[PDB]
Symmetry: C5
């Protein structure tokens, strides 16, 4: 599910929260004017994951990519904080969100 | 389980030992004023994992993130050494702690 | 499957889209005259994955290698954007494309 | 099992060979006076894995940590070359040693 | 299996092709005079994987280590291009070679 901390951080930004997304594609592109990391949902929505050249965005963007990659490979849900101001929309946070059953 | 060495190292500091935590969320955030790595337990407690720009904190923080990520993805327990001087609490050490059966 | 965004990006380049490729070999070569990363399909086609020394090609090429590697290890499909202007053909984008069942 | 080359390399040093260790904990610690990577066996023995700032110890220590981490996550045996000049003992080599059956 | 391109590249060098090797040990060593990455087969043969300090050998040697590690951990075959001018033999290329059934 979604952590309260993740919801609170997305509420402090213009980016929109997207809950319980199943990612089915991750791509890396080095073509001259289309460079970057793209992810797509089961519903056919695409996002761009921005990179980072300087501390701390360098390690943080690398962790965003690791999470997106594991979600596609392991078929595990994520929550996103995404800016609609771009095409495709830009991921500014990602949360790995394995679905756990609570039987009580 | 928890290693004696992990308990001894947390006992050498003002940070508190937290044993047998199941992590269910890991997040990476590059939003302007919420940047960082966050983890949440099955109980709804959140910690922040500090980064490292300089040797040795750079590789050590990278190993803390790898441990936290594998714990969420594989549903494996961790032990934490966490400072309560922060909100959220800061992880200063993490131990991967797969539950092993001993039948004797 | 293939994302619309991946097809749109390949349509913006001289590179050709190859859909639903099963990779069965990945290699790393440090021989003087054959240096680089090679991938081969079940059909016996080979591509070269270019490296990157400078941001952003450094992280993007690293993610292309991670995707190709996971595809071979997990026997999971990819989509490629490949330039025929080279021997072997050069990968300029790769998309991890696990086959999902839709029963509706 | 243990490779001949691993035993020969440990025999070339003051460090002691430890065969068929099951690791059950790995930890990364960024506390002021306990910084480092620690690993613990099923028997309750602990070692320290030294870091490396400069080529080649930087990549070699990184591979030592990857091996120890995989061993704990996958419950796979290692062999160690450890210096007893330190408490805890310092790992100067580690070998991933998955147990294979030979029925002949 | 072995890709035609991998055989053709090894045939253009002094190094010898070794097909369908099962690796059962990978080691990382930081001892003064034994430093490096070693891999050993089920047959008891050992190779050394050379490191790389400068682009492109730095990323290519890192991918050779990733391939060898996955082969040991997942019990998956590799093909090697190895120089017999060294003892142990030096790997100049490695190909991940998961065994596929072809029922036709
Ligand atoms: Na918001
Ligand atoms: Na948009
Ligand atoms: Na303490
Ligand atoms: Na095209
Ligand atoms: Na071509
Ligand atoms: Na010795
Ligand atoms: Na040859």
């Amino acid at each position: 599910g979604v952590s309260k901390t993740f919801k609170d951080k997305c509420a402090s930004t213009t980016a929109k929260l997207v809950q319980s997304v199943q990612l089915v594609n991750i791509s890396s592109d080095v073509n001259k004017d289309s460079k970057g990391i793209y992810i797509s949902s089961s519903a056919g929505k695409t996002w761009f994951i921005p990179g980072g050249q300087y501390y701390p965005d360098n390690y943080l963007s690398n962790e965003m990519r690791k999470i997106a990659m594991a979600a596609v490979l392991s078929n595990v849900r994520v929550n996103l904080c995404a800016s609609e101001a771009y095409t495709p929309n830009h991921v500014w946070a990602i949360e790995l969100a394995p679905h756990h059953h609570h039987h009580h």
